[PDB]
Every structure is written in structure tokens, then in C-alpha cells.
């Protein structure tokens with residue numbers, strides 16, 4: 001049923017992320033609604049994303065991404081090497097949130113992808129506490145020395161002591177013994193997790209890939225990490241996508257596994273070749289140990305699954321957008337002949 005993206009070795013994780021976003025159907029529908037009719041054919045990242053999405057949705061042949069990469073200005077070999085995957089996501093989703101501003105789909109990116117957490121300092125021997133709320137669109141999880149996603153989460157919210165050299169400064173009170181930590185207030189409908197497999201190394205001043213075993217489940221209960229649970233919306237997550245990489249460097253092989261409709265029927269998207277695969281190939285096989293493994297995972301909250309993955313028909317694509325892309329295709333085929 002699904003079509004691939006053309007191979008573009010220098011773009012590393014880009015293709016895998018494009019598919020991930022394409023299959024967040026509620027995002028996709030919102031993308032098709034952006035008022036792009038006036039945009040510049042070659043400078044508009046919102047237009048270029050609509051074009052990629054349309055073509056992934058209608059083309060029988062593998063879809064191209066050069067107009068997209070031009071639009072957001074990452075046209076060099078090391079544009080992709082100087083950035084993390086989530087930084088690409090931010091560049092894409094921001095352009096798109098901004099273009100949806102003032103429209104009926106304003107607020108769609110925050111609604112899907114944004115959560116809130118509290119970061120806090122608590123002094124031990126005096127009453128003074130500081131709470132600060134931060135929003136996040138993604139979470140970077142540590143995997144070195146952790147067996148599984150559960151353990152990463154426990155480490156994320158684990159309390160970090162501050163004393164001796166590392167003491168905290170409590171103004172009125174003094175420098176003080178304290179505890180530092182984070183808790184989640186909310187977890188969004190679509191949860192983007194990056195795994196910290198690529199880490200700086202001082203002993204050799206260079207980033208190295210860590211290929212250790214790291215287990216992640218199909219079904220992920222996260223109530224334990226919330227500051228306050230909701231008994232009417234339990235934080236149960238369902239695995240949607242597994243972004244995978246083989247080898248040790250930016251020359252390696254990047255693929256993504258998805259179960260697009262949430263029903264546990266999986267596929268592997270390996271640039272232009274899309275094929276059915278087993279649940280075992282998408283999940284277990286990419287734990288690592290034994291250089292092929294996952295560096296980013298997408299989960300969808302169970303109570304939102306129906307909404308996030310609502311069907312998208314061609315009726316959901318304004319005809320002004322169809323005509324403009326179909327005219328582009330007409331003229332390319334014309335210069336071709």
C-alpha cells in the first residue's frame with residue numbers, strides 16, 4: 001500500500017523521519033490545510049512538506065525530497081552531520097506550526113507533540129523550594145548502563161543531590177544542601193523519544209556510537225513518571241515507529257519500521273523499498289548487542305490512537321493544492337518529452 005522515498009545518502013535520518021511524520025495522520029491532514037497558495041514554489045518549507053506528503057499518498061513511484069531540502073537550507077554534506085534528528089523535526093514542525101497560525105488548524109503541533117514537565121530544587125534543611133514548568137516536544141533518554149525504557153525513565157526522574165562543590169544557592173537562606181529533579185505533568189498524544197546512542201568522547205575528542213542492548217516494549221505504561229495520574233486517561237503508550245541505524249557513522253544505513261494504522265501489522269521503509277515485516281523484526285531485532293539498532297521511537301497514547309491515526313482521504317486535500325502539484329507534474333513531464 002505504501003511508497004518509499006528516493007535514496008539520498010547524505011541526508012542520513014531524514015527519510016525515516018518524513019515517513020514517521022507522514023503516518024501521523026492527524027498532522028498530515030493539518031499540513032494539507034495550510035494556506036500555501038501564495039507561497040514561493042522553491043522557498044516554502046510548508047509547501048515542500050505538503051508536496052512530499054501528497055506524493056507519498058498518491059505516487060506509485062518513489063518520492064523525491066530535493067525541493068524540501070532546498071527549502072530548509074540543509075544542502076551540504078555536513079548539514080545533516082552537524083544536527084541531531086530531533087533538530088530536523090523542530091525545523092520542520094516549527095515552520096508548519098507557524099504557517100498554521102491564524103488558521104482553523106492553529107495549535108495542531110502543540111496539541112499532538114507537546115508535554116509539560118516540572119523541574120525543581122528542594123533544599124533539605126530549610127523551607128525553600130523552586131518549581132519551574134517547561135514544555136517539551138521530545139525526550140532524550142539515556143541508554144548507557146540501562147537495560148530498558150523503564151530504566152531510562154527511572155533515571156530521567158531520579159533525584160540528583162547538590163552539596164559540597166555542587167551546592168545550590170538559595171538567596172535569602174544561604175548556599176544550601178539540596179535535591180534536583182524532574183517530573184512529568186503531562187505526556188502528549190504522540191511521544192517522540194530519542195535514545196542517546198551518539199555520545200561525545202574526551203579520551204578521543206569525537207562522538208562515538210554506543211551499540212549496547214536496549215529493550216523497548218510494544219506497550220509502554222508511563223503512569224509511574226507523572227506527578228499526578230488520571231484514572232480516566234491512564235498514560236498507556238503504543239509503539240508506532242522505530243527509527244533504526246546500522247554501523248558506526250553518518251555513512252551507515254538508516255531505516256524505519258512502522259505499523260502505520262496502529263494495529264501491530266508492521267512494515268520496513270528502507271528508502272525506496274517498502275516491505276512487510278514481522279513484529280519481531282521491528283522491535284526485538286533492533287535492541288542491539290550481539291551494530292543495527294534503534295536511536296528514536298515514536299509512541300502514541302492509547303486513548304488518542306483513533307484520532308491521531310484517523311483515515312485521510314483525498315477529500316481531505318484542498319483542490320487548490322491538488323491542482324498546483326498536478327500542474328508541476330504536467331510541466332516536468334513536458335520538459336521531459
Ligand SMILES: O=C(C[C@@H](C(F)F)n1ccc(F)n1)N1CCC(O)(Cn2cnc3c(cnn3-c3ccc(F)cc3)c2=O)CC1
Pocket residue numbers: 012013083084085086140194195196197198199209245247248249250251252295
Ligand atoms: O544519525 C545520527 C548519527 C549517527 C552516527 F552513527 F554517525 N547515529 C546513528 C545512531 C546514532 F545514535 N547516531 N544521529 C541522529 C540520531 C541522533 O540525533 C540521536 N541522538 C539524539 N540526541 C542525542 C543523542 C545523544 N545525545 N543527545 C542529546 C542529548 C541531550 C540534548 F539536549 C541534545 C542531544 C543522540 O544519540 C544521534 C545522531
